[model samples]
Target chain A: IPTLTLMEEVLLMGLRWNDSISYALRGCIIIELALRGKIRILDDSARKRFDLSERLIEVIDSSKTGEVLLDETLQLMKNDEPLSISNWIDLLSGETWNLLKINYQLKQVRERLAKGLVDKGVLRTEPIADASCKEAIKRRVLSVLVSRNMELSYNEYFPETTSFKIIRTLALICGSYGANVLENVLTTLEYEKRDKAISRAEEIMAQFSQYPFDLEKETELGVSVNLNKEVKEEIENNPGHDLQLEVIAGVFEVFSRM
Target chain B: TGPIVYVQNADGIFFKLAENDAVIHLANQDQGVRVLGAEEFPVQGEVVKIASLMGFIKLKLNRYAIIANTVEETGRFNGHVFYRVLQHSIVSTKFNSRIDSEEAEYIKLLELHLKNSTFYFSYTYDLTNSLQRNEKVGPAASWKTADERFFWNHYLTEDLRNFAHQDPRIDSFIQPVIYGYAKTVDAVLNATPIVLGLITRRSIFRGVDKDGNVGNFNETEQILLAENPESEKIHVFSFLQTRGSVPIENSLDATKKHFDQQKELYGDNYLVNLVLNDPKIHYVYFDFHHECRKMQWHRVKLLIDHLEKLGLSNEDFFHKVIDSNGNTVEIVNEQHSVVRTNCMDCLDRTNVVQSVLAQWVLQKEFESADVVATGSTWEDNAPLLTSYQNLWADNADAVS
Candidate 1:
């Protein structure tokens, strides 16, 4: 079987064998599609003029992601005009004010995914020892953080290739904590480390809450947070430079709040 | 539960949002936009009772905001009141006067559907669900989280839910409604007073549409709540099964949803099929024409007797006897299984058998509650039998 998608992991952890994973799942799916190059921020004057979350997003790839939920969501983006992250999240959550567009809300998302997992045999069993075979999600998460060397692509499960691997994990922790599902592996940490980890999550959230994400002012984690000059220059003159990581961060911010 | 009310007179309809002429939006009757400082705003015309805001939508090119203008109270079940919308006002979202041809035609279609159908709602009740589902859910959840399949105006009410997140006034204006049939009859039997409430909700997913398409499917549900004087307790019994089209794409096993829903709401199920037996007509590879082709009263009784031998028939429908004062006294003599009737075009033989079943159970219900003397029959009581027959017969024209 294929590896579980990013949104699937969050849902499995949110349900963790049990439910109430609401609008956050849609946010996570948006983040997954952005990372997979299925969509990108409009990257026009909007980013410089408005907040990152308010900037519209367009589909870069209309191809399927092999996952049912992601493919459906991607198809929606492909079919409709570009929409802001907040609006997209609202429409998908059935929290819209437009009855004509309310049909876009994905119903029974968690139930369908749980059933998908069962068909995959990942949910029917008690242990998740494979689909990276060497370690579970908890272990993969720990290895990236504990190593203090944010080289994220090696772990087959969380194949985060962008430079903001640590930031992504930080956002993941904030989202899980917001959904009250982080206690699974959080209590395993020593008291002091757990507190510090939570503090770091809070710190990153405040910094990334706005656009053009900043970390140069205060280097609390002592890790690199800047995009390389090549990637930075590529965004200025390009109309559709594909704000890949920026859109991911935007969707993550929404998910964390949810 | 108080809603904003508007008034109409010789000078045009008016409503005070706050101070005087806080004209946020103008009613569709007049294409007038906000009249801030130009003209004298009509202070008080007349106050007419309005129920709730239906929703706002942009059909083709024109935007319209709908609100329940005239509401008539229809049925009250266990202190929860339900109302049928008699009239509603649709306002232009924009201040423009131009509407395209297609847009105008669609607007007329919307009005046609709105006026032709009956929608029910309540400030203190969730009309989309029957008593079983309503009680199963927690009290903290409002009627806003209604199921979409039964929520008729779900798509239109998006702006209300969104705006209500901040403004309390806008929030209060938000309401959810279900398009269905509801009627309540109160009767007295032997020294005991009883209330009979019947409500059936329709599925928005099924049934045909005026969009010039061909699709056939319908789901139905009926719940009866009896109010008792002993301890002021109420007994709730429900589960009027659905009659939907046969699944042509059974490969997807999407029908699992219907089966699962039945099991969840009504516990066990006994599926009975009545259709042409020979593969000569109306027969598919996957069929359920097991019983006799032509169903009769004796055959239905035989089916009932067969279930009775298995200890399935004659079981009480349900007795969710609960103390009206925040407690359940005891749930006694409740049904644990359901006879899921299956057939095609719901009127002829299908309604006949189901209505007969309802009569038997209701009679047994009166007997179980001890509301009547021994061997007291509906036919013996001329008044009761007449009303019962009228209710069931009228439902044929009423529901259709």
Candidate 2:
């Protein structure tokens, strides 16, 4: 099997079993950078004070990392002065990127990861169907996630050579998204290790002060950001404009699989 | 419009207020009558209470009186006279629609009785036409005499909709098109029957179309289903999808609209809307799925608390009803506050919440009876809760 990059593994784990995407991918990107040592936390307090390492600037300038999204993120970080984690999150979530754009950076980052998986043979590219590719990725990712958690077979997937940074990153991703993996993320650890992972997620969550992770808020934001004024107008003109066409359309696909 | 009649005898006035019908006794007429809307000392004689279309005043006498102008009908009950008013020469402020406690309770029971008795009748055109061709049609044809007493007292809605396969009225055609059904579970806390209504809309397209899964006419139906003239104590649990393939945004908007409409019709506090669904969680793993559901019980607990505050009807309560002879007969009375529950399919989530509500009610019953303390939770009554949970789960599967 081909070895996975930090960004690639994040994509593999963060991809949803469901077709829809969410802002949780932003957390994945930050964790990937921290794992790569491209970013380091200077303070562990509420501000989650962090600074982009000097090496990340070099990595961007030299083009040492072949990944397009990783390079772009590094370049963006190099352009900015060191800031609090909340500001970084806001920037990544696109609140500061553009007034109108929402979660733009995260979407671009996630899309790049999807393409990276295709290039890495983890996802098939022949069909060129987005749905199929996501399904394929989710199947493989969940298999690894479920088995590792179920059997506590950490060594099978992450050998002794695997760094604690990567393992902790997995713990964070699983803690947020993987129901089965979340248990493995917590129980698969020694008491202290589990404590570390829980605190890490809290630290990341604290940074989302501007954008709460409420399901209702997430949906409302999706509507305001995704549906264009003209499209929204057209939908409003339609008889069942109030009906959530997006959710209903996605629901049918879900039932088809079940 | 005619004069306002202030009849003496508080009982007679109270009876008119309770009945929502104008029934005056001759004994009360000794004080004579005055018409507010008019000023006519019209001729008076013995009159029988009668039904009115354009609204006629009713008068009660010992045997018989000129109740209507035509005097077309007469009926005898318990050697006493009864009259149906076809037209009245006088109008009075007799039919009082006040919200008295007993009157309110009577309305609540009547509403519950209607919801309990509602039925859905649908049949294909081909079969219906065949039956018509064979002279198997009309009211007599559809009548089942053996079930008369039950059907007569019950059977509120005659919602007969054409569900023919080729008909454009129905979006999708399944194998079993003609479906007629009614809820049979009648639970009585005291004398009052508890109404358990499931408000699920059928999927427009057949075969697991999650997007097509919608809620029923709960907005209007709820107004009619759980209307309490006196108190806005109705509790409704809706477990519709707040996310996923169910056009969740639109569905919720529509659901909100329904709820808002009900609140508008009644007071804002009329119905307790419990939008039950864990949007952030998916049913991927057993433990996680359960956790997702567990997180939502706090909202359910709020509902349980409300029911507790409302307090079940007194066990030894009794009520009086006017017989055909116009004599009030005291009867043992017990009533239950209604709990209306539904989900997308009125199956899984509906079943679960219904079970939870039932358990909470049972817990309340136990506590109130001093069988358990007020501080006791479901965990404190493990065996009972577990047994109820299992039974409800099985019922849910069967319902789905």
Candidate 3:
């Protein structure tokens, strides 16, 4: 009261003059407070009093270990303190939101799976060395992709998963092709049920060549993998195994080994 | 087993100069007059017709008149009439384990009617059950009605299976089990009546009257006056059997995408205004061009997929058709843009799949379609062109 803090003065200023500040800025102020570690009262108070909760803020701020936040959010579902649509989004990420795009991509990806790219075991498109520049480039590439697909929001559907952002970012750094985020979503979708794991894998491995991205890596000669005899025969005979699974599985395995 | 009186190999007698023999076995059984006479012929052929199994010549000659205990082979009607009289016993007793003389006579009449007439003879064999006539006829018509009764009996037996299959409960359970449950919530379980339609036209033939003079009226004209009551222009009627759910027109993904995008971009207000008042573009038809092309592509791909399964080549599909303008059009050989653009109607465009289906699956006068072996099943299905018609009356309404 003696002398309004920068916070109070700016708040008063925002309310008095600027209309955009009222709509979009207030939320940003509260978010910045939460981020700076001084918004505990807002977290602890009731909706009628403080208009927010700890469980929700935790989900919003804690980007890593998203599954835990998701589980907690889902547990507190309809328990008086509900998660905001924006917070629900912060966890879901882009892969989940772009389900329709995923379906369209599936048409392309399924073709590559049927064409036998992964089963033959081509892997490794250079290594992830430069993180920052690559991350920026990937974000740029993915932003254009989302824009082209008319997917206005990129990080909406997936609950903080980063296949689109991470793979795209990494690919940009390594000069590798951006992976099909739809394919990543499909992997999660397959894991949601069991038989899907094998069948979907089979579908993708057979048809990998049909994808432009797969074609790019193969053409670049950047891929390296252990082309096992059984896998080789399966690819040659059927040539319709799912490429997405094979590529993702191969990459993950190689990194895990390292 | 006895002295063979008449014997002839059809091939030896006629195969050199002619293609087929005159005498055809009316029925291959030892019980009746299986052997046909020369006078019983319907076409121009010299050799006697014989009944044989597996197209064998040796087995057919075995049915000839076998002289068992002949009363000396001499002139003065030696055993010709006797042999003719014994024909019933010789064949019937030899073929069937038991027989009646009257039954034998009846069989002969049937044999004669069948052999000398230019009638369509339909024969049915039941593998499951012993067949017997189920209808009763007057004594006067009994001899003449056996064939019809036999046919009707077989029909009744077969129709029983069809009727048993008709129970909707059986269909409800059986169909789902057969097809593997379709991914639909409101599935039609009730058996719908399937419609079978047939159309026929008749022509009047001029014939001689009873006075041995050519009649002024044709046969159909005479029948019309004598038999037809409502002879108003020889009324043409259609027979249809309707069953199942009414088909509805559905928008495909591509067309739906275009519609949705337009709705989003223009907004309903803008669209309505443009449609109602705008002069530059007729909004309703303006958005249909792409949709028509998309549907055409969808249908063609569906056909090509189907044809490819049949093991036909693209060349086979190309030779199949003549366009409405009488020009032979090879669907694959033609330019893609030219064909796709031609898919749209100048006035209407939303409904194009039906035309595509018809081009690919339905009969076209001059065009041929070949199935593609490799490609997306969707791409392969493309050759369906405009062949199969969708069953949607709504589709007809939408296009019109």
Candidate 4:
């Protein structure tokens, strides 16, 4: 078996099923690691803040495995200032990155991984006239993920009886697509063996759900107010509204490795 | 007034001076010079000698010094006062006569539209009152200490009103001032808190041209500054060059000048120009009234093609940037590449484009991090996109 970097494996497992939940896996990865003690979530004050462990940093520093995207993210953690969990979520979730070089770098990680899979003969690359292969993959995956009526045969396309299947299922569940899709995905499971895998996946997701920054809970909405009464009244009564500013503590929670 | 001591730079001998006057003695010469009173005093206002027995010396009132004093006292009104004058200008019969000029026609259209727009009268009235009271106008802290002396002194007088009555169209001097005020009020009046958990900062840059009318409408250097986590991590600055009041055609001309300037500044650097409006699609009254759609449609592709020639952000993950303290902190995905966007007011369309570009950036980051599958459209990542859109929209509203 070819050795895959942590991020590569995470992406492969999360996205192999063509699920939308692939987006949340980045945030979930941090949560899972934090829960398991590989990474730390520092302060519980206003915003959750975190940093990489010395052990993990050492691994990243010593092992120049050269997965640019993963290494770059790791390098961001190692070199830059401590980040708020919200910023990490935004960065990981693709909420607010600017148009520049890194965007290409990040997008190409999955592209390169898909290409790597093709090279390994796990997936076939269609020699289309254009680079529409990626586009076709996205559309096909989108249709599968959105349509509950269509039955998907995972084993037929992706080799059967592998950990990749379970990882894919688990990643979608934790990706927070929605309750409908979760229930829909759950229905595809088999009897005892798959049921056990389902519960195991549910358990890990529950571990993440228990973390401080619970995605399930709704944050408090802010109301605009200033020294002025008219503006405040207009804000409350009119369509105008306010959003609360999120704050993260200066510290990071430590997660130790055995 | 106390004695205003002035320095003389030419070759001359210092003469004895009284508390309020100075007396000079002319050397043996055929023509003797007469000392005049304060009204006819040397314009330089300094007491000194002529050359020598063989020299001729003539002193005239320092007209330059007097003019400088008058200019200092009167102050310069560089078009920011037009919004106030706009109301009076619209009512004036003579000013309204110039319907033939496209610029005047556009102003007339805006005058009617702004009158009907929600909060137009109230915001303008409030801003005018604030100016009268010598209060800070814009809500954004960027202009908290900005000098409003020029705005007050210029608008409070009959200057702009007289110019409006005399000139066929609104004076070009006050157009930028009005536009800047409108933008500032839009941002301030609509100011709202940033999303929870996201560190964001909004900064404003006014790129007014010194040669107001001589420069094209697109030569105005208006910029919106944005950042994540307050500072240091990521910085996204959007630049705009358009006069507040100009015909769409003139705006295109100004935009070209701005692009030319950018070409000189950027050199071989990457530039991404995204114009928001397609006049064909954005033909609605509200869209057209803001007056950017037509102009943006004309210039957006040209700017984008120019940027394409320059290239986009590098394929690397993060770029290096030096902060104010001279410390080397790596700016993540530093956009050496500039994204220039515009729409009919540069309010709504620019905001939408910025949000779209930001999403593109985020998607790229997600992919590079190996977080999601590549080719995830912003829609596929819907939930976060909603928040991101809201963020960008609110920001646009703030600055509109």
Best DockQ goes to which candidate?
1
Q: Candidate 1 residues B56-109, lDDT tens each?
A: 675644456677777888877677787888876664433212334456556667
Assess each model's interface with DockQ, reporting 2 decimals per model: 0.01, 0.00, 0.00, 0.00
What is the CA-based DockQ of model 1?
0.01
**CA shift at B374, candidate 3, in angstroms?**
62
lDDT, model 2:
0.32
| Tens-place lDDT digits, model 2, residues A1-258 | 114554455444443332222233443444445445455433223332322211111121323356676566666667666644444444565534121112224444556777877776667654332444334333333333333221212333344354432234333343244222233224444675455445433332332222111222222111112212323334444343121222121222121222
Question: What's the residue-level lDDT of B9 in candidate 4?
Answer: 24
What candidate 1 gets wrong by more than 4 Å, as runs, is A1-258, B6-49, B93-97, B164-171, B207-234, B276-300, B306-311, B324-330, B333-336, B345-348, B373-379
Candidate 1 residue-wise lDDT, A1-258, digit = tens: 226665667666654232225666777778777767678877477465766777788887877878898888887787788889988888787664343454477867867787777776676654443445323566545543343433334454445444334444555555565555666666678886666556555655666565566635554553333322322443444344347667866765675566
Q: Rank order by TM-score, top first?
A: 1, 4, 2, 3
Badly placed stretches (over 4 Å) of model 2 are: A5-22, A43-63, A97-110, A127-157, A169-175, A178-258, B1-400
Q: Candidate 2 chain B, which ten residues in sequence have the lowest lDDT sum?
A: B218-227
Report the lDDT tens digits of candidate 4 across residue range B281-332: 1111112223476576445434434433444431322323334443334434
| Full-model lDDT, candidate 4 | 0.31
lDDT of 1 at B367: 69
Candidate 2 or 3, higher TM-score?
2
For each candidate, the alpha-carbon lDDT, in order, equals 0.58, 0.32, 0.23, 0.31
Worst ten in a row by lDDT for model 2 chain A:
A51-60
Better of 1 and 3 by DockQ: 1
Q: Going through the candidates in order, state the TM-score of chain A alone for each one.
A: 0.77, 0.45, 0.17, 0.40
Highest-scoring model, lDDT? 1
